[PDB]
Amino acid sequence: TSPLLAPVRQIHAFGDAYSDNGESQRLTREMLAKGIAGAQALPGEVYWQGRWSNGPTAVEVLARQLGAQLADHAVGGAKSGADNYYGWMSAYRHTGLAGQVDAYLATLDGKPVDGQALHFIFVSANDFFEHEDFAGEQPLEQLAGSSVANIRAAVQRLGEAGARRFLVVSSTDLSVVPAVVAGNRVERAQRYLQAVNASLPIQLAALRKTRGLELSWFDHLTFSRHLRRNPARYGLVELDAPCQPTQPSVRPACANPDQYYFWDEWHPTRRVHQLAGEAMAARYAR
Numbered sequence: 282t283s284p285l286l287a288p289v290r291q292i293h294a295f296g297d298a299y300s301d302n303g304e305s306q307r308l309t310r311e312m313l314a315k316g317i318a319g320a321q322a323l324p325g326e327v328y329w330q331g332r333w334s335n336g337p338t339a340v341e342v343l344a345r346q347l348g349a350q351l352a353d354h355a356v357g358g359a360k361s362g363a364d365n366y367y368g369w370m371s372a373y374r375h376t377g378l379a380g381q382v383d384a385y386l387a388t389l390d391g392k393p394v395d396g397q398a399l400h401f402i403f404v405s406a407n408d409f410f411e412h413e414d415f416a417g418e419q420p421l422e423q424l425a426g427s428s429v430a431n432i433r434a435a436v437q438r439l440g441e442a443g444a445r446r447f448l449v450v451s452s453t454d455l456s457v458v459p460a461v462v463a464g465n466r467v468e469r470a471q472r473y474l475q476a477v478n479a480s481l482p483i484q485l486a487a488l489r490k491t492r493g494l495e496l497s498w499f500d501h502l503t504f505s506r507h508l509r510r511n512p513a514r515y516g517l518v519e520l521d522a523p524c525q526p527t528q529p530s531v532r533p534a535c536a537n538p539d540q541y542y543f544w545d546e547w548h549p550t551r552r553v554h555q556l557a558g559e560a561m562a563a564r565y566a567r
C-alpha cells in the first residue's frame with residue numbers, strides 16, 4: 282500500500298442507480314405531477330427510501346466512513362453521455378453523466394468549484410443495458426470506447442471548471458447481474474466490461490498527470506470477484522438469486538437480505554453497497 286490520500290469533507294457524486302440516493306424518485310414524482318409523456322414512478326414500491334436497493338448506496342457509505350457531506354447527483358438509468366436508459370426523460374431533463382455535470386456547473390453560476398470536494402463518478406452500466414435491450418448498432422468494443430470517452434470527458438470538463446479531486450468507479454461485473462444471466466448475455470457483458478476497464482484507467486492516469494489531479498480508480502470488478510469467491514467470510518450465502526424478485530412480477534422478499542448479493546435483478550443489496558463503500562473509503566484518511 283502507498284500513503285493514504287487526504288481527508289474528504291464534501292462529495293459530489295455523479296452516476297446511476299448504483300449511487301442514486303433519491304434523485305430518480307424526486308424527479309419522477311415531479312414529472313408525474315406535471316403530466317410528462319411516458320413518466321413512471323421510480324424506483325418502485327419494493328425499494329428503501331427511493332434508493333434502488335434495500336438500503337444506502339456505496340457512495341452514501343463512503344461519505345459516512347470518511348466524515349463527508351454528500352451531494353448525490355446520480356440518477357437511476359443514467360448513461361455515460363447526456364441522457365438516460367429511460368428515453369422519456371430526455372424531453373424533461375438530461376440525466377446522464379454529461380447532463381448531471383452540466384447541471385452541477387450551471388448551479389454554480391460562475392462561482393468556484395470547491396477544490397477540496399471529491400468528485401465521485403460511477404456510471405456505464407446503462408450504456409450496456411440500453412444497447413442490449415433496444416438492439417443498439419455499435420459493436421460492443423465501440424460502445425465501450427464511447428463509454429470510456431464519455432467518462433474521460435466528464436472528468437476533463439469538471440477539472441476545467443476547477444475540480445481537483447476524483448474517484449472514478451470501474452464497470453461493475455455486469456456478467457453476474459441476474460438480468461444479464463437471464464438474457465443469456467454473460468459473454469457480451471464480460472467483453473464490454475473488460476474493454477471499459479482496460480482502457481479507462483489508462484486514459485484517466487494521463488488526464489490526472491496533465492491536469493495535476495488527485496484521481497483514485499476503484500476496481501469494482503476486483504472487489505466483487507473477491508467477495509463472490511469468499512462469500513462466507515462476508516456473511517453472504519446467495520450470490521445469484523434476487524432477494525426481491527420483480528420479473529416477471531414482484532414476489533415476496535427473502536428472509537435474510539444481508540445474506541444476499543442482489544436485491545432485484547440489476548442492483549446489489551445494502552450489504553454489498555456497505556462493503557463497497559468501505560472498500561472505496563480504504564484509500565483515504567478519515
Ligand SMILES: CC(=O)SCC[N+](C)(C)C
Nearest residue numbers: 357358366407410527547
Ligand atoms: C427495475 C429495473 O431496474 S428495470 C432495469 C432498468 N435499468 C435498465 C435502468 C437498470
